[PDB]
RNA sequence: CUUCUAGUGAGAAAACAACUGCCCGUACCGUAAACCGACACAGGUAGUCGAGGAGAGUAUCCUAAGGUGAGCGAGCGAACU
RNA sequence: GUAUGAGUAGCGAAAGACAGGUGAGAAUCCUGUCCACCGUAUGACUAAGGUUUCCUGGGGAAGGCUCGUCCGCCCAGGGUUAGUCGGGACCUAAGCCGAGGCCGAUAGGCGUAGGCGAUGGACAACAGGUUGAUAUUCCUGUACCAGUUGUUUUUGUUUGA
RNA sequence: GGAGCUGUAAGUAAGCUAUGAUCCAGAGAUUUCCGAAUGGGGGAACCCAAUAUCUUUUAUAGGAUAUUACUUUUCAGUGAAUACAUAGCUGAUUAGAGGUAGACGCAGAGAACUGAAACAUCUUAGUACCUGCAGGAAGAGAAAGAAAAUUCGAUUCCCUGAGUAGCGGCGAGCGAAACGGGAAGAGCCCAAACCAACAAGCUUGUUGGGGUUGUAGGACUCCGAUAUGGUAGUCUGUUAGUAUAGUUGAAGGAUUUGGAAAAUUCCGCUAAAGAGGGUGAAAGCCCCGUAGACGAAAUGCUGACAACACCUAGGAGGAUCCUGAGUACGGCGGAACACGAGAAAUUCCGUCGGAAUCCGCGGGGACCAUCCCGCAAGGCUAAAUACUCCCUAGUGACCGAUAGUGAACCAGUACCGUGAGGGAAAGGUGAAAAGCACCCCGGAAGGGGAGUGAAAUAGAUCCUGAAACCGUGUGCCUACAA
C-alpha cells in the first residue's frame, strides 16, 4: 500500500473549512517518495515520507 | 414400567374395575399395557384381513399401566411394588408381603 | 469402488426381456461408473465374455404421496451385450 | 459376530469380507427379482462387513 | 495439418488375424395447449426442407404429400351494435 | 366469510353431418363414410426453452371456460443404448479470470505470463430394418478413424533405417 | 438399563432380543461429492490431468491409493543481465486463507431525512451503513496524574457531583470533570549507561550479564548478604469436587352419581415428600415425580497439594557516566477534548522548522515569575464492566392460534420476482378408533337403516358452532298505493 515503509504515515481523511465552516471531507496524504533503499542488505524501491529521510538514517543507495 | 408382560395385575380403575388377568402385551413408549379380557372392544373389521367374514371382531383394548396393579402372586392381592437387590440382583418386591415380584 | 458394487441389480422389464432373447441384459450400475468399468465387473462376476456394454443415465422422476413431492433417485442403466459362444447370465 | 472376527487373521478377515461381499451382491440380485425371502439377512450381511472392516482399522 | 533441420535413435514399415476405443446429451412439445405472454391467451419465437396448374414469383386462387374441423351448443332470423 | 349486480356479461377468429360402437350416462370419446379448412403451411425437420408433458394400462374428485366414458389432468408401471451425430479429453475471437507485478484510506481497481471462453476453425459411417415408446445410438449389410498384441514378409542397426 | 425392539408411520414382509436387544451417557472408527476448495478447469455439488505404486487385460483402453494451489517464515541447492554477487528457479520447512452470533470491543472511512418551526454554522451524529482486526471479553492501566482541606497514590465500572461549570447563528440545543460514596484490586518488564564473550574492520555488531527511577534512580566505588519472600508460569503428576447416563425414594379402601372417579360420603394412612405433570371428570396416599439418600468405566472442567519453572537483595559515596531525537516543542492546515478559534490550555493527525538533557525536563486551562506536583517521547498486566448464536435448570398479576416468533402444522416452505429481495395460509374426533361389519338406493359420490360410543346434530370439511348469507314450514298482514 502507499504507506511509508518506515514511519507508517498513510493518507488519512480531513476536513474544508471554508469562511462560513462549511465541513466537506478531504484526503491529507503523508509526502512520500519513491526511494531506493537497503533493506536486508539488498536495494529496493520503497515508499518513504521526507520526514522519515530529514533525519539522514535511512540509507539513500 | 412397573408392571411388565405375563404379570397378573388387577384393574383398580375403568369399566373393568376389579377384574384381574395376565398382561399379554405392554408398550412402554405409550405408557399402556393390555390385559387379557380386559376392556375389550367390538371392531368392525372388513373381509379383506384373511377373515372371509370380516364380521365384528372382539379383542382387548389397551388401557393406561397407572390403572392396574399387580397380583402378589403368593398372597393373591394388588399391591404396590417396591425394589429390594437380592443376591445382588435388583428385583420387585410386594409392599405388602416383601415378596419377591 | 469394488468390481461387486459396480453392478446393482437387473432390470426386468417388457424391454429388458427382449434384450435376453437377443443376449443382452441390461443391469442397474453404480452412477459413477463407466462402461469399460461395467464390462469388467460383468465378466468378473459372471464368467461371461461380453462383447459389448452400451450406458444411458436415467433422469430422477418426480413423484410425490399426499402433501409431499420430490424425485426418486437417479439411475444408470446398462445393457451388456455377450458374445456368442459366451455362457449366458442367469437371474 | 464381533468375537469370531477378532478372533480370526489378517487373511482370513479380508477373505471374509469378500466372501460376504458376493454374498451381499447375490442377495441384491435376488431381491431384484423375487427369489429373495429373508430380507433382513441383506443388513445382517451390511452389518457384518462394517464390523470387519471396523476390527481391520483398529488392528 | 505439410515440411525443415535441431534433437532422438534400434528398431522400423507393410500385409494379415484378432482385439481395444471413456464422459455428457439423445424421450417428448417445439410458427406451440408442452417455450416467453398469470390462462389449453387471435401476440412474440432463430435456422433447414417447403410440391402442382396458371404465374416472374415462396405473390394470388384451387390443390398434392401431410395435417386439421379450433373444448359450449340448439333455436329464432326483432331493435340496436 | 358472505352478499348485491345476477342466473346477468363472458364461454377467446373457422364446418360439420349422420351410422355404428363403448358406456350408469354421449352434440363433446372411438370407428366408419361424406363434407369442409391449411398446404413458403395449420406440412416435414431442428436450435433454444420447457423438463416427463413421451408409451402402455387404469380413473373421472379437482383442472378442461359446456359435456366428457376423453385429455398435455390424476393413479401404476415403462421408455432416452454412439469410437463416427452435437459437446468434453482439439484450437482460438470478443469478453472474462489472472502467479508474480502496478496502483490504491480499508475494501479493492488494473494488468503481464498463463488460461478460460463459440455463435467460428478442426475432426472417422452410411443404407435399410426393427419397438408401444430409442435409434447415423439397437439389429442386418458394408465401411472408416486412432491404437494394442501376434504371425509372416521386407530393412537397420551408431558411414545410423 | 433390564424387556421388548426394527423412527415419523399405519400396514404387511422379514427379523433381533436375558449369550441382555431397542434405548441412554463417555470415548473411538467410517465420514461420498461441492464448498476457503487448494492438481488444472468450471455455468457449485461436474469435467480433465501429471507424478509414483499397485491393479484388469495377451496388450492398448480401464480401475485404486498417495502427492501436486497461492502467498508468508526458515533452510538448502541451483542460478541472469555481470565479474563477484543479487534477482530469479527448484525442493524442503513453516502458518495463513474461510465461516460466524443480525450480540458485545477496537479502529479506518463515514451520510441524509430530521431539529433549528425556513437555512448554510450548528443538530440528527461520529449515529446508520461499508471495511479491517479481534477476544471471550475487548479497550484502559502502574502518574512528565489528581490537587491546592493538604494531601491522594495504576486502570476500569456504579452512585453523586449535575442538567451544575461550561460550549452554543449565546439560537435549537450540546454538556463535563475533580472531590465524596462503592464494586474490584496487582503490579511488573525492557532501551541506556557498565561488564564478559564472540565476529569483523581502536569502534561496532551478535550473545550473555547489569538496570529500570522522581522523598530522583541507576551505573561506577566501597562495604555485607549469598538468604528472604513471591508468581499473572507447566496439556507435570496426586487428590477432592464437579459436568456429561442413572439407582432408590412414604402413605387408601369402600359408598353415591357417572360410560369412566381423582368428584360426593365414611372411615383411614403419609409427609425431610401438600412442587409439578399424567391417569376415562378435580388424586398428598394409581403412575411419573418431588423431600431425602446414593451412583461414574470413560472424557472434560475447577480447586488444592507436590514437583518443575521463573522472579525476589541491604547500607554509604558521588568524581565521572546513563536515564527513550528528527522526539518534545513551534508555524501552518485539520481533528479530539462537554469547549463550535475562542483569551485557549491539554491530546492527536499531515506539512515544514526544530530543544534541553538533572544547575535538566513537563504540568498546575493564554502567558511570565514564584511555589507545588510529576519524569514524556519503550512494552506487558488478572478483577470489578459489555454481550448471548448456543447448552442445562427454572421463572412470569407474559401470548393462547387474526394472539405469541414470519413460522405451535414438513416455514423462510408454498407463492411472487431475471436478481437482490418479498413472503403466506394452515392447531382441537373420541377416554379409547371402538374410524360405522352387514343390508338398501346409487356408476360413484352421498345417503337411509344396522352397529361402535356416555354422546354420531362427536363420522374424520369431525369439540363448541355466533353473525352476515341461503332455504323450508307458517300465526298475522299485503294487489288504489307516493
Ligand atoms: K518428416
Ligand atoms: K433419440
Ligand atoms: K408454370
Ligand atoms: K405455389
Ligand atoms: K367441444
Ligand atoms: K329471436
Ligand atoms: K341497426
Ligand atoms: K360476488
Ligand atoms: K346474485
Ligand atoms: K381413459
Ligand atoms: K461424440
Ligand atoms: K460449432
Ligand atoms: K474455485
Ligand atoms: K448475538
Ligand atoms: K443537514
Ligand atoms: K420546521
Ligand atoms: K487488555
Ligand atoms: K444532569
Ligand atoms: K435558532
Ligand atoms: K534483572
Ligand atoms: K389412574
Ligand atoms: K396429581
Ligand atoms: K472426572
Ligand atoms: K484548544
Ligand atoms: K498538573
Ligand atoms: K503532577
Ligand atoms: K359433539
Ligand atoms: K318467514
Ligand atoms: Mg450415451
Ligand atoms: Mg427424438
Ligand atoms: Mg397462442
Ligand atoms: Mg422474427
Ligand atoms: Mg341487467
Ligand atoms: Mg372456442
Ligand atoms: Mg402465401
Ligand atoms: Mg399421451
Ligand atoms: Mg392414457
Ligand atoms: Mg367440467
Ligand atoms: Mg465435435
Ligand atoms: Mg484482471
Ligand atoms: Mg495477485
Ligand atoms: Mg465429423
Ligand atoms: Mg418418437
Ligand atoms: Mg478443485
Ligand atoms: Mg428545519
Ligand atoms: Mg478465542
Ligand atoms: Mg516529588
Ligand atoms: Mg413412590
Ligand atoms: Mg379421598
Ligand atoms: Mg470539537
Ligand atoms: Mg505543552
Ligand atoms: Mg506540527
Ligand atoms: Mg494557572
Ligand atoms: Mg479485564
Ligand atoms: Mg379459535
Ligand atoms: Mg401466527
Ligand atoms: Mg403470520
Ligand atoms: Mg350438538
Ligand atoms: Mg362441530
Ligand atoms: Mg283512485
Ligand atoms: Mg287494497
Redesign the pocket.
Known sequence: ????YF???????????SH?????????????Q?VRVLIDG?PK?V?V???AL????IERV | ??????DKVKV???????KEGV?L?????Q?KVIVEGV?V???????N?AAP????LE?E?????????VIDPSNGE???????EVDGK?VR?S??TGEVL | ?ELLDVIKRP??????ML?MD?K?Y?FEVD??????????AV??AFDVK??????????P?????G??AG?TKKR??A?V?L?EDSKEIQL | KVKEIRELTTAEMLDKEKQLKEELFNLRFQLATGQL?????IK?VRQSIARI??VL??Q
Not at chain 1, 500500500?1 to 511509508?4: F, G, I, L, P
Not at chain 1, 462560513?20 to 512520500?32: C, D, E, G, Q
Not at chain 4, 425371502?37 to 439377512?41: C, G, I, K, L, P
Request: with cysteine.
Open positions: 500500500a502507499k504507506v511509508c514511519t507508517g504515515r498513510k493518507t488519512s481523511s480531513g476536513n474544508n473549512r462560513a465552516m462549511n465541513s466537506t471531507k478531504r484526503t491529507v496524504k503523508p509526502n512520500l519513491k539488498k524501491k515508499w515520507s521526507t520526514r530529514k533525519s539522514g538514517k | 414400567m412397573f408392571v411388565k408382560k405375563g383398580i380403575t375403568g369399566k373393568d374395575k376389579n398382561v402385551a405392554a408398550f412402554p413408549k405408557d376392556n372392544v367390538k371392531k368392525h373389521q372388513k373381509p384381513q367374514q370380516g364380521g365384528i379383542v383394548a389397551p388401557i393406561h399401566v397407572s390403572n392396574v396393579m394388588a399391591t404396590k411394588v417396591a425394589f429390594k435388583k418386591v409392599k405388602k | 469402488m432390470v426386468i422389464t417388457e424391454k429388458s434384450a437377443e443382452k441390461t452412477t459413477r461408473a463407466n462402461k469399460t468399468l461395467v464390462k469388467q465378466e468378473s461380453v462383447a459389448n456394454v452400451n450406458i444411458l443415465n436415467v433422469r422422476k418426480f413423484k410425490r404421496m402433501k409431499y424425485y444408470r442403466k445393457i451385450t458374445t | 425371502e429373508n430380507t433382513a439377512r445382517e472392516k471396523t482399522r483398529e
